[PDB]
Structures are given as C-alpha cells and as structure tokens.
Amino acid sequence: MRIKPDDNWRWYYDEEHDRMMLDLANGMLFRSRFARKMLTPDAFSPAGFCVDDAALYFSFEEKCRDFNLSKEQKAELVLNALVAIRYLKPQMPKSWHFVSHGEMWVPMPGDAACVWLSDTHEQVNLLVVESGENAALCLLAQPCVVIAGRAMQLGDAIKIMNDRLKPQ
Amino acid sequence: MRIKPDDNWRWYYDEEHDRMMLDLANGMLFRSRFARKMLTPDAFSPAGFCVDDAALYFSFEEKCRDFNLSKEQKAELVLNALVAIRYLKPQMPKSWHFVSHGEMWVPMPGDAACVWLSDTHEQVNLLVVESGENAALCLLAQPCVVIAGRAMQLGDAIKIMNDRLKPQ
C-alpha cells in the first residue's frame, strides 16, 4: 500500500491557509478540503493521529479499492473522510437536486453510492461516511461536479437524503 | 516507487510559512528546507514541474537508492535536491570545518560523499547536487548534524571544497 499511517502523523489546523491538515511527516503534508467554517471546535487544537484514525483509514482504504480513481485520488478521498468523521460540523441535508427513488435504502459507511442530478440526469459518485436515518453524509468520489450553482471536487462533503442515494 | 511526478505538480513559494513548496497535488504538499533568504528571484513565481525536473527526479531517486535511509527520507532528500538545483542562490564554500585530504577528487552530481568534522572526527554524509572545480554544492544526507554552532538536518545545503569531500 501507497501511504501507511504512522505514529508520527499530526492533525493540525493551518491558520493562514484556513484548512485542516495532516502532517505526514518527513516534509509531507496533506491539505484537506475543509476550512474553519466547517470544523467543530475540536479541530483548532493539534492532535496525534490515533489508533482509531488508523482503523478508519484501513477500512476506508479497502472500501475504495475498486472506485474508478488514481491511487493518489483514493488516498485524498480516504484522508478527507477521516477529517469529515472527526471534525466536520453537522450538515443541512440536500434534497431537491437529485432524482428521487420511491424506496428508502439503508446506506452503511464505506459504501459506494450514486445520486442522479435531476436536471442533467448525469450520474454522480459518492462515498458514504456517516449514516443517519433520513440523511447520510457523503463525500464526492469523482474528480469534480457542478451542483447548485456550486462546483465541487473530490473530497467535498454533502448530506443527502436516503431516498436520493443508490448502490453503485 | 511510491511518489511519481505528475503533470499536476507545481512549484510555488509559500508567503506565510516562508518556504519553497511543491504542490503534489491531490491534497499533498511538500515543504522544502529552503526559505526566501536562499532563493533566486525565479522562485517567487509558481511554475509547473516540467519534463527536465522529472528527469532530475528520476536520476536522483536512483542515485539515492542505497543510502542508509527511510524511503520517506530519500524522498525528502531528492525533492530538496530539485529545489536546490532549480532555485538556490550561489553559496559561500566552507573550508575549515572539515578534515583536509592532500588530493582533490572530482565529484559528479548524484554522488554519495563523506566529510570529516575536524574537531570530533565524526563522519557526515552528503549528497552532491552541483559540481564546480573548487566547490561542490551538497545536501546533508543523514537525519541531523551539528557544524559550526548551527544545527542542520536532512536536505540542508552547504558548498564544500573538493579537497574535503571523499567518496562513500
């Protein structure tokens, strides 16, 4: 495997570029997708990467093996998922942008999900990171997409309603 | 191999942390050893990692395979070499901190070199990154050392006189 979690990793908030980061260490850094706006007040205090984060990392890594992405992309995808799980504030679920399915499906963390955009009918691929019973928090699991007016790229968060999500 | 140069790599200087970086991309960043003080005015303008850089990367990587280091440390070593070659200002060669050898040897870029410290006789490993006929730019190729009063760690530049350098 390409990157392997190590005792030396540190989460820290970068004041100047306004983004959660991981120190890798050894000259390497990972700048996540998430800025102050989206972090819980935990985030603002450096913390070691712990066994629990290691564990989530290993599961996510395997759950993503078969997504259609560069192994560099899979890494960024899984590292943002840890940031989201650990530090993201609660999200306001989105509904009406996506083709609705008459049944609700229970989606588990680590699942590959599609939604359909209700105007373009373009399929978009997500990774599920957190469940709920109405809403599921997902990360965008493809290089980019345009949603409301907004553009988003790989790693970006969005809470979607379970009736809009579907297995790949 | 693990890190592979990619069209999306960008050199840029980071105003806020005063260091030359490389964007890797995919969330990954590399922070080199080198601050404003040591850069040619080129540095202050972002630039794609180009085919020539890619070439230097590949020879330096191979010339460092058998150094006594972590593959993470070899990565940091080589990346700093690239910064050094591309962007470092001319250096003032040092002389007197190192055990002299009555003959001058010709050292090629890419070479593994030792200097001896003249008071401790401790051996220190370097990586040659530029040649000249008197002076040869080297990066420190071991985790850390103490030289004049200064500390230095892996990736740090110093220009040394060729009579002071010796092959591994």
Numbering used by the authors:
A (entry chain A), B (entry chain B): 1 to 168
Describing publication, verbatim:
ZapC has been discovered as a non-essential regulator of FtsZ. ZapC interacts with FtsZ and its intracellular localisation is only dependent on FtsZ and none of the other downstream divisome components. ZapC has no clear homologues of known function, it is 180 residues long in E. coli and is found across gammaproteobacterial species.
Phasing, automated and manual model building, and refinement produced an atomic model of very good quality, resolving residues 1–168 of ZapC, with two molecules in the asymmetric unit, at 2.9 Å resolution. The protein contains two separate domains that are linked by a long, extended and irregular linker reaching almost all the way around the molecule (residues 88–109). Although the fit is good, ZapC contains an extra beta hairpin (residues 141–154) that is not normally present in Tudor domains. The structure of the ZapC crystals described here contains two monomers per asymmetric unit. The dimer interface buries a contact area of approximately 1500 Å2 (out of 8900 Å2 of each monomer). The concentrations of monomeric and dimeric species can be calculated by integrating the baseline-separated distributions, giving an estimate for the dissociation constant of approximately 30 μM for the monomer–dimer equilibrium. Given that L22 was mutated to proline, we think it is very likely that this change disrupts folding in this region of the protein as prolines do not support regular beta sheet formation and the side chain of L22 points into the hydrophobic core of the N-terminal domain. To investigate this conflicting evidence, we probed the direct interaction of a peptide derived from the C-terminal tail of FtsZ with ZapC by ITC (isothermal titration calorimetry) and obtained a KD of 32 μM, as expected for binding of a short, flexible peptide.
